Amino acid sequence: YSGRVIFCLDYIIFTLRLIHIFTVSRNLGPKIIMLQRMLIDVFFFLFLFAVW
Amino acid sequence: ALIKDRPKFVRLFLENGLNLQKFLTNEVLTELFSTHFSTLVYRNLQIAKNSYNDALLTFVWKLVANFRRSRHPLQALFIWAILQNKKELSKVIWEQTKGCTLAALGASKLLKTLAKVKNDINAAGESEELANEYETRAVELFTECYSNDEDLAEQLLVYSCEAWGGSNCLELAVEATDQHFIAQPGVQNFLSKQWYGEISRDTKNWKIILCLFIIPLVGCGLVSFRKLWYYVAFFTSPFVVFSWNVVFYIAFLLLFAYVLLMDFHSVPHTPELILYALVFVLFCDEVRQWYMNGVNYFTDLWNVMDTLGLFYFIAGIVFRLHSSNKSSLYSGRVIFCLDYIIFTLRLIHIFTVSRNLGPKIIMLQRMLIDVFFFLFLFAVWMVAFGVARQGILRQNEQRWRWIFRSVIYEPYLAMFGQVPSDVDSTTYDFSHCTFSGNESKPLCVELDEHNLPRFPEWITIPLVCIYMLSTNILLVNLLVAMFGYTVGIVQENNDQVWKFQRYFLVQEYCNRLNIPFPFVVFAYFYMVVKKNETLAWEGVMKENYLVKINTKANDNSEEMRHRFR
Amino acid sequence: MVAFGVARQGILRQNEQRWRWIFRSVIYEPYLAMFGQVPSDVDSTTYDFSHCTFSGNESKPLCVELDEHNLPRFPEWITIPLVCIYMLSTNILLVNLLVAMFG
Ligand SMILES: CC(C)CCC[C@@H](C)[C@H]1CC[C@H]2[C@@H]3CC=C4C[C@@H](OC(=O)CCC(=O)O)CC[C@]4(C)[C@H]3CC[C@]12C
Ligand SMILES: CC(C)CCC[C@@H](C)[C@H]1CC[C@H]2[C@@H]3CC=C4C[C@@H](OC(=O)CCC(=O)O)CC[C@]4(C)[C@H]3CC[C@]12C
Ligand SMILES: CC(C)CCC[C@@H](C)[C@H]1CC[C@H]2[C@@H]3CC=C4C[C@@H](OC(=O)CCC(=O)O)CC[C@]4(C)[C@H]3CC[C@]12C
Ligand SMILES: CC(C)CCC[C@@H](C)[C@H]1CC[C@H]2[C@@H]3CC=C4C[C@@H](OC(=O)CCC(=O)O)CC[C@]4(C)[C@H]3CC[C@]12C
Ligand SMILES: CC(C)CCC[C@@H](C)[C@H]1CC[C@H]2[C@@H]3CC=C4C[C@@H](OC(=O)CCC(=O)O)CC[C@]4(C)[C@H]3CC[C@]12C
Ligand SMILES: CC(C)CCC[C@@H](C)[C@H]1CC[C@H]2[C@@H]3CC=C4C[C@@H](OC(=O)CCC(=O)O)CC[C@]4(C)[C@H]3CC[C@]12C
Ligand SMILES: CC(C)CCC[C@@H](C)[C@H]1CC[C@H]2[C@@H]3CC=C4C[C@@H](OC(=O)CCC(=O)O)CC[C@]4(C)[C@H]3CC[C@]12C
Ligand SMILES: CC(C)CCC[C@@H](C)[C@H]1CC[C@H]2[C@@H]3CC=C4C[C@@H](OC(=O)CCC(=O)O)CC[C@]4(C)[C@H]3CC[C@]12C
Ligand SMILES: C[C@H](NC(=O)N1CCc2cccnc2[C@H]1c1ccc(C(F)(F)F)cc1)C(F)(F)F
Ligand SMILES: C[C@H](NC(=O)N1CCc2cccnc2[C@H]1c1ccc(C(F)(F)F)cc1)C(F)(F)F
């Protein structure tokens, strides 16, 4: 069971790399690039939410 | 001078007593076309004509080939000049010709034809520059021409082409989506007058609709009818026919629904027969439209959807007649319901000419990329979380239906509202387990160790929290932000785009037989049984246009320098 | 709303012969789906019955389907996708477009 759990977590890590490898399509990649610039807003929202 | 590309000398020769008609009438033309042509230009023209072809491409290519092997003199020099991207030699030829707006539009389309090729970047960009240039000239010429005489301008716009390219001025404009030319007031007003018909364009836009329901009310002159006799003119107006068809379509939809769900039996009753008759008439009109067009009729989607609706309906008709089998009746009812779904959504499409909300409907097409991007991200996250949770909880399932139900459906259900799963928390569980697969319930949780759940709680709950946080609120808010930007940016272009579509629909509706829908059958049955001055005025307006250009050029007010000298 | 409601009601409960209930099922529940809850739990067949009324005497919805020798007859592989697509389009896409237009 412990090994199966480790496998599932490894699968989670493996899957998300698809979004990264799909940055050259030229049909939706420029949108993927802009996600990096939106982290500060998320962090600010999380700070306020956690305090409340 | 023509051979050596001396534009100023050409102009000086022409204006200073030279007669171009006599010079062109000589056989020199043949010579000028047999040898002068650049080899690469000839090869590129031939390959372009072969690859794409068109109503005009073949005409000019054939004339040129005829001259090379061994009337319309100036139309040949114009194309000669325009092929080689000669800016200063094409304009003079354009000025000399007759009916020059038409030639300018054709040349604009022709230049835009070859812009796409990537063999040479500069060779394409320069030609595209000239293509853009000619459109403004044509538009300004027509705008100046129309501001003086409405009737003569409208007459000019419908001149029957004498095989310049086998198409009219308006036809050439619509060929290549030069929306600016059509969107300009003049053509729009022409289309409005064409659509309304006899009725005046100041009828208050609601009195006619009121009079439509009350046939006897036509007598009293509530409407400014002037541009019995009325009852054959009022009912021939395309506007009234369209409104009456819309009303009939809504009534048919109501009857179809009532027959479908309220009253359905093994043996059809009279309402079913009436509905069959109406769908038959729709099918006949569909075949008419199929005939008048070729195979390009299938290029768009709505016609395909209509065809699919008719085919589904006839398939349902076939299915339902087997009264012996009770199951076939249910299958036919299902087919009818799906066909009804297809039928209903066409209302939104047919409501694109209201002018009160249609421009909004047009913009929906530009928002598909955002939806697809959102769906891509959502699907990836859904797959990840579902696979992980199902793998860690319920060991082996050996049933495709339930595994697909758990992996995808519930995490998808988590998008709006409810938590993806209550199984993650262990405080409540059991009473729904099924150790054996006989029962139709999910496989029991975990591989419980001496009768206790085995999975931990300190990984499942954070998984759920993070997954829901990312999918439910972040992605949706990003979607709304993208929608906001997209709707904001494309606003100004929207009106022109919608006006172009307005023309495309106005001509289609005017061309139709213009008979109220129920009685059209008789028309087809009877059909089966049966089976110069304007150019001079344009030249004058051109003289004025060129004088205006010269005055604009001279408006620099720099003559003080030469006066000082 | 009209499209989805008519299709679902037509495919599930055969003939109703009661204007009030047909209007209640065709319009009201799909409308209720706009904010929050799923338009209908009837689509899934794992849970059903205990609310059926074969006769129209009682004030409950007409029983599901024309069950064949005591089993529900309607399939699950068209109803569920219908619900998913309808809810996707109505609940979130239209509302987000509304907020963008308001902005
Ligand atoms: C179940 C399995 C066996 C089949 C699943 C199908 C996918 C593997 C196929 C379907 C469509 C394919 C895609 C069609 C288009 C593109 C864009 C292409 O990106 C570019 O090169 C664009 C370059 C540019 O625009 O200049 C890369 C391949 C990709 C993702 C293709 C790769 C593989 C895809 C995703
Ligand atoms: C237990 C089962 C359900 C696991 C399924 C594995 C998934 C991770 C695979 C199966 C099919 C895959 C999809 C096949 C096709 C596409 C379209 C592809 O989009 C494009 O091709 C863009 C091309 C372009 O526009 O340029 C993005 C990935 C996606 C959703 C693939 C991503 C991963 C998917 C969902
Ligand atoms: C239950 C049934 C029998 C009656 C339902 C009523 C509808 C059939 C009526 C009510 C109001 C009518 C509408 C009133 C206004 C317009 C706009 C009109 O669009 C235009 O021609 C605008 C042209 C322009 O703006 O320049 C087309 C008819 C329509 C949809 C009318 C057609 C039929 C409608 C929808
Ligand atoms: C089982 C029963 C409930 C089925 C009912 C059939 C519906 C598909 C019909 C019935 C009444 C129809 C409506 C009657 C009037 C209008 C207003 C109409 O809007 C306009 O007239 C715009 C005119 C303008 O502003 O220019 C749009 C369609 C709508 C909602 C019609 C669309 C279709 C409706 C809802
Ligand atoms: C359409 C997009 C935008 C939304 C996402 C779609 C999924 C949520 C849909 C697509 C196909 C659906 C599946 C198609 C078929 C079935 C089998 C069905 O169970 C049966 O096979 C009933 C008959 C039998 O027991 O044999 C349960 C739902 C499921 C997994 C459906 C549930 C939801 C799925 C995965
Ligand atoms: C013990 C719990 C957390 C269960 C294990 C699950 C984690 C392994 C998953 C849950 C959420 C996942 C994270 C979701 C978001 C991000 C940000 C992402 O940041 C980037 O690399 C892109 C930004 C940039 O390039 O600058 C990297 C993966 C990470 C940490 C993901 C990787 C794996 C995480 C931590
Ligand atoms: C107002 C707009 C913006 C929102 C959409 C309106 C519908 C959700 C409302 C309009 C009229 C309502 C109906 C008006 C009358 C009735 C009959 C009522 O049942 C009865 O007739 C009780 C008395 C009896 O049993 O005889 C149940 C609700 C229903 C269908 C109402 C339910 C919801 C409806 C369709
Ligand atoms: C087996 C399942 C899917 C039950 C059957 C229901 C389908 C027939 C319905 C459900 C959702 C409907 C779709 C919702 C959205 C669209 C996009 C729409 O795209 C356009 O034509 C407009 C865009 C453009 O003009 O470019 C066409 C109809 C379609 C596929 C609809 C047609 C019929 C669909 C597929
Ligand atoms: C992570 C990202 N994928 C996403 O899907 N999103 C979701 C949407 C979005 C919008 C704006 C900025 N970032 C994201 C991003 C995201 C960022 C942070 C978190 C955290 F809170 F968990 F940290 C979760 C997801 C990829 F894997 F590609 F790197
Ligand atoms: C389909 C459209 N009607 C709509 O109502 N919408 C809803 C709102 C909207 C907003 C932005 C872009 N498109 C739409 C559009 C829509 C687009 C895709 C989907 C899909 F996901 F199912 F594919 C469903 C609906 C009409 F029938 F008229 F063609």
XYZ file of N, CA, C and O in Angstrom, chain B residues 64 77 89 104 192 197 263 267 304 370 463 482 487 496 522:
60
model
N -4.277 37.016 -71.904
C -2.832 37.184 -72.016
C -2.225 36.067 -72.854
O -1.358 36.311 -73.701
N -3.278 46.773 -70.641
C -2.151 47.554 -70.139
C -2.246 47.734 -68.632
O -1.224 47.741 -67.934
N 3.317 53.762 -63.163
C 2.786 53.477 -64.486
C 1.373 52.919 -64.459
O 0.669 53.016 -65.467
N -10.452 49.622 -60.152
C -9.699 49.736 -58.909
C -10.052 48.609 -57.949
O -9.165 48.019 -57.321
N -30.875 49.201 -47.463
C -32.078 49.455 -46.674
C -33.277 49.718 -47.575
O -34.350 49.119 -47.394
N -38.719 47.863 -49.507
C -39.642 47.712 -50.613
C -40.502 48.940 -50.823
O -40.017 50.072 -50.727
N -48.864 14.232 -26.301
C -49.702 13.248 -26.989
C -48.846 12.453 -27.970
O -48.567 12.917 -29.079
N -50.038 4.544 -32.801
C -50.528 4.891 -34.133
C -50.644 6.407 -34.212
O -51.258 7.015 -33.328
N -25.451 22.558 -42.677
C -25.189 21.173 -42.304
C -26.098 20.755 -41.158
O -26.634 19.640 -41.141
N -10.620 31.223 -25.788
C -10.575 31.282 -24.332
C -11.237 30.059 -23.716
O -10.707 29.455 -22.772
N -5.175 17.269 -0.535
C -5.375 17.087 -1.967
C -6.684 17.719 -2.413
O -6.724 18.481 -3.386
N -10.337 37.055 -19.044
C -10.048 36.932 -20.470
C -11.251 37.341 -21.312
O -11.101 38.025 -22.333
N -13.901 41.052 -25.059
C -15.071 41.836 -25.435
C -14.702 43.305 -25.564
O -15.223 44.014 -26.433
N -18.916 47.188 -38.252
C -18.623 46.951 -39.661
C -18.807 45.483 -40.016
O -19.378 45.149 -41.068
N -47.464 25.442 -54.254
C -48.075 25.694 -55.554
C -47.062 26.264 -56.538
O -47.080 25.919 -57.726
